[PDB]
Amino acid sequence: LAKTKTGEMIDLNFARKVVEENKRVLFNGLTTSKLRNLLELINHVYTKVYNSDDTTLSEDVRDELEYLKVKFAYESGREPAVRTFIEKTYVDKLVDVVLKKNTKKIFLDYCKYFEALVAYAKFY
Amino acid sequence: MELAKTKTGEMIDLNFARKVVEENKRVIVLFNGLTTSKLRNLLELINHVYTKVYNSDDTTLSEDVRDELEYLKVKFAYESGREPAVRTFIEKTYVDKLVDVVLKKNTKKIFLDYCKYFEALVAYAKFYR
Amino acid sequence: YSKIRIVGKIDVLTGLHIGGGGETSMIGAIASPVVRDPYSRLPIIPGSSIKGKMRSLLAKHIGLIPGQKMHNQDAPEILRLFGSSQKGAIQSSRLQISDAFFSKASQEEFDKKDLAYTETKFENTISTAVANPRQIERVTRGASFDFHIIYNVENINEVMADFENIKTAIHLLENDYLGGGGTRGNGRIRFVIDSIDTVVGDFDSSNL
Amino acid sequence: YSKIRIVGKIDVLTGLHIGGGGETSMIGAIASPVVRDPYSRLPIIPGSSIKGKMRSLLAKHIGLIPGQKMHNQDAPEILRLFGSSQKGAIQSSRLQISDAFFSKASQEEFDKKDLAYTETKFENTISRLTAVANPRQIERVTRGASFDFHIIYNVENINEVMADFENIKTAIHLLENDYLGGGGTRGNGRIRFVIDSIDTVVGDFDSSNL
Amino acid sequence: EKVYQVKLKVYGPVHIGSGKIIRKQEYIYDRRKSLAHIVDGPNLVKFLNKKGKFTAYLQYLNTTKERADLYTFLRQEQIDTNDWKTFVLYTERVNQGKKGMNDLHLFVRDGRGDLYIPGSSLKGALRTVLEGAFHSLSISDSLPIDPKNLAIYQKIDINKELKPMPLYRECVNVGTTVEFTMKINSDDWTIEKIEKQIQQAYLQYWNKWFVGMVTTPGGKAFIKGGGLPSVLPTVLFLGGGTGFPSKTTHYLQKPKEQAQKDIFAILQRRFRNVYGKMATVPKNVPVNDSTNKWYQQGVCLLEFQP
RNA sequence: GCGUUCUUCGGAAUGUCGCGCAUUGGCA
RNA sequence: ACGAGAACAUGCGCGACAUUCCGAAGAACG
């Protein structure tokens, strides 16, 4: 997917690593509802990409991902915990990486990473 | 069979699957209240990758299959968090550990053996009920 | 031996949902996906669903025998239309209802209007008043599927009765629902027949 | 002696389920798998399947004799085409259907778009009294698949070749209008014979007209 | 099976959400116009990228983190309203009990994009009324509703005082008729039986709990404004926000004190932050327009015709 | 505005055939 | 100058028939 600091690769195991690192409460006070709202924001563009057969991300999908970045910034502003979650998970940069790749495979990998984040947050 | 070893050291196989199902059998709630439908959902999550590998003949696990196995670990963790009974089932049966073991081994045979182990778990859970 | 073809379209009225059995789905999305044709990744109404629903509705309309256990115990006309597997009394199924693929006209209409072929209806289950969120993928209203039904003329004299039963079954299916979730509204559908033509044989389909 | 080769492809329409050997299936896997070529694990249409289906359709179209029990009691045209085994009247089958293997073109088309050759279809069986549904997973070949089919006709009587090939065309038309597989009455088995390359592989016979 | 057309007359705003929560950062609310234009995010983002205000949009988001009303940003950038209509999907009339909006819920729409009342919700309301069969009853999905009848309403909580909640929801306007088709078998259900059960359930809901809210001073002001119609027969509570006393069988199958005790216990085990702290049984357990008239969330009237 | 459910319980194939005829064989 | 010499385990054949991915569930609770 992408490369984190010190050569770390974005992965579902990396999602578990982030969840266990930020566990103390999670991500300095992150709740399940905020992460749920972020996953809901992911869901619409995920379904749009899933329905589309073309491997290359469609233009409306790319604009949806840009608006997803904007909404992530807004959520980070609204709640400091969401900002901490975003900066620890590097999801905002992952959206830009997906846009750069312009491939369905990278988008679904990022969606699976976010899904792993949600699953491990629920598990821990 | 010949998948891995538990923390205690007991070997993992179909006989181990029957043994763990019997141990968690309580009268009949199994694995601390694990309903059949949760087990069947886990079995379908298994069965997707099982069909993907069963059609294929490559000895090594394909990259898409490995990604689906990691996603299977994610789904197992999500079900463990969402339902305590599924968490107990996975912990006692060591399913997630076997998934990482087959990921390490990267063989069609070991994946088929893990799927047979999960199938034995489901079969003995249905039988011991 | 005459094969009569009934080609037409079937258009959803409230939203059809024939489930595919669940599949790899992100958390909170694609809870119960609709059955789709693997080749085109397009929603499809299986011929099995249409035939089974029509057979069951016809059986209810005619009247099930008391304490019926198997589908090979329906009315003789239903058994001659939809087939039978009774030991020693096997009856060939004259109706060969096939899969109702997504019509190209409706597919291009949806593409023109920038509308998804399937709507992910987000519903729940109140308990304690605790809900159970779920995303059921049901076919978007106004989607037409082309249905193709083969009728075999096993007996010429019985063709009129069999086609009257077919008309009654179509009327019931339009009146009743198709797929799953009918009591909740989703699954009501409508038939629009295009042409009944006898592709094979000397039988005349103009009267039909 | 002349042998005429009919090489073409059968293109699936709704997806055909030629049931397999009923091998031990995983719990929750396909309860009824399709017949597959063991070497390539690809679904195939057995030549026996095509031959039996088209022979039965042709016999029905011609008309079964009253109270017919054995296959050798078919019409003389059907016996001449597909063969007979009646004691003292053994007619050789002029048609030798071969198993229709998964075509390389459709195999590449399925390798593209990340499509599996066979799809697991979920079905149920609503009870007539308890109204309970019994799940069933049936493997079915994908609608977009194609199987390269190979038939061989033996020219035993040059005068009857035209009539036999007319019967073959009628049977192919019937099979296109009918289904080829299990569950066709429920919509599994619709096909079409798109490509047909009739050439005389052996002998001086001319198959241009055929 | 017996078939009846079902008419639902909306006497109070009814919201059937689509599982998506939208914020003021996503739409544009004009208080002077009193209209909220629902903006689709991708087109707005591309518009700002073309106009060069996307960096300005990020800076505006950074400056005021909690409040990021898109209308204020557009007014600051002096972007023309005709340019606004490019990325506006539609517009909705807004009624606030307060300033501005906080968090908007959207009504459910089909894949075609038409507003409709799912038959699942209506059938669930009927089942809860009749709870105490449910297969013969087949409530069909509603006919598509005109977008004009859909407008944004404000949620107000009545706890001894009228308190506007920072939560607006798109709802079907009062006086709108919704049509369904209901089919039932004779043996399992009777139309007279189900109608009588609806009437008795509404009477029990009125007697057990509604009087207690009327006795509250906020309830008294609600009655004075016109929140309770004189007509309010067959009354169904469907929209999101009707309340715990509705959509539950506690007030129907149990005595008033017993039902209140059970509801208090389940609220305490569910919501410890509010009812768990309180150690005594409350007296009662547990919408505004541009005009003077007040509304009750989700209240409706049902009629059946063969 | 915040928080909680994100899918749940059952069915997971069943029944019918599972080789038959002809020659080899038997009896005449 | 082999208990040998010739001799196709061959001919006929639809893994098919019957089967709704369904039954029940209010995006709603504070």
UniProtKB/Swiss-Prot annotation, chain B:
> According to the entry, what is the taxonomic lineage of the organism?
Bacteria, Bacillati, Bacillota, Bacilli, Lactobacillales
What terms describe the molecular function in GO for this protein?
Answer: RNA binding
Q: Which domain of life is it from?
A: Bacteria
Look up the record and give one Gene Ontology term from the biological process aspect: defense response to virus
Q: Which InterPro entries match?
A: CRISPR-assoc_prot_Csm2_III-A
Q: Record keywords: Oxidoreductase included?
A: no
Q: Corresponding gene?
A: csm2
UniProt family annotation = Belongs to the CRISPR-associated Csm2 family.
Q: What other note does the entry give for this protein?
A: Encoded in a type III-A CRISPR locus.
One Pfam family here: Csm2_III-A
Q: Does the keyword RNA-binding apply?
A: yes
Which keywords are on file for this protein? Antiviral defense, RNA-binding
CDD domains given in the database record? Csm2_III-A
Q: Under what name is this protein listed?
A: CRISPR system Cms protein Csm2
Function, in words: CRISPR (clustered regularly interspaced short palindromic repeat) is an adaptive immune system that provides protection against mobile genetic elements (viruses, transposable elements and conjugative plasmids). CRISPR clusters contain spacers, sequences complementary to antecedent mobile elements, and target invading nucleic acids. CRISPR clusters are transcribed and processed into CRISPR RNA (crRNA). This subunit may be involved in monitoring complementarity of crRNA and target RNA.
- Describe the protein's quaternary organization and the partners it interacts with: Part of the Csm effector complex that includes Cas10, Csm2, Csm3, Csm4 and Csm5.
UniProtKB/Swiss-Prot annotation, chain C:
What EC number(s) would the UniProt record show? Answer: 3.1.-.-
Record keywords, A-Z: Antiviral defense, Endonuclease, Hydrolase, Nuclease, RNA-binding
Q: Among its keywords, does the record have GTP-binding?
A: no
Cross-referenced InterPro entries, in alphabetical order? CRISPR-assoc_RAMP_Csm3, CRISPR_Csm3_endoribonuclease, RAMP_III_fam
Q: Which GO terms describe its molecular function?
A: endonuclease activity; RNA binding
Entry annotated with the keyword Phosphoprotein: no
Please list the GO biological process terms of this entry: defense response to virus
Superkingdom assignment: Bacteria
Q: How does it assemble?
A: Part of the Csm effector complex that includes Cas10, Csm2, Csm3, Csm4 and Csm5.
What job does this protein perform? CRISPR (clustered regularly interspaced short palindromic repeat) is an adaptive immune system that provides protection against mobile genetic elements (viruses, transposable elements and conjugative plasmids). CRISPR clusters contain spacers, sequences complementary to antecedent mobile elements, and target invading nucleic acids. CRISPR clusters are transcribed and processed into CRISPR RNA (crRNA).
Additional remarks? Encoded in a type III-A CRISPR locus.
Q: Which family does it belong to?
A: Belongs to the CRISPR-associated Csm3 family.
PANTHER family, per database record: CRISPR SYSTEM CMS ENDORIBONUCLEASE CSM3
Q: What is the official name of this protein in its record? A: CRISPR system Cms endoribonuclease Csm3
- This chain's source organism reads Enterococcus italicus (strain DSM 15952 / CCUG 50447 / LMG 22039 / TP 1.5)
From Swiss-Prot, chain E:
Any single biological process term in GO: defense response to virus
Instruction: Please list every transmembrane segment annotated in the UniProt record, as residue ranges.
Output: none
The record's keywords, sorted A to Z, are: Antiviral defense, RNA-binding
Q: Which GO terms describe its molecular function?
A: RNA binding
The record's comment on protein family reads: Belongs to the CRISPR-associated Csm5 family.
Give the note.
Answer: Encoded in a type III-A CRISPR locus.
How this chain assembles, per its entry, is: Part of the Csm effector complex that includes Cas10, Csm2, Csm3, Csm4 and Csm5.
What is known about what this protein does? CRISPR (clustered regularly interspaced short palindromic repeat) is an adaptive immune system that provides protection against mobile genetic elements (viruses, transposable elements and conjugative plasmids). CRISPR clusters contain spacers, sequences complementary to antecedent mobile elements, and target invading nucleic acids. CRISPR clusters are transcribed and processed into CRISPR RNA (crRNA). This subunit might be involved in maturation of a crRNA intermediate to its mature form.
Protein name, entry field: CRISPR system Cms protein Csm5
UniProt source species: Enterococcus italicus (strain DSM 15952 / CCUG 50447 / LMG 22039 / TP 1.5)
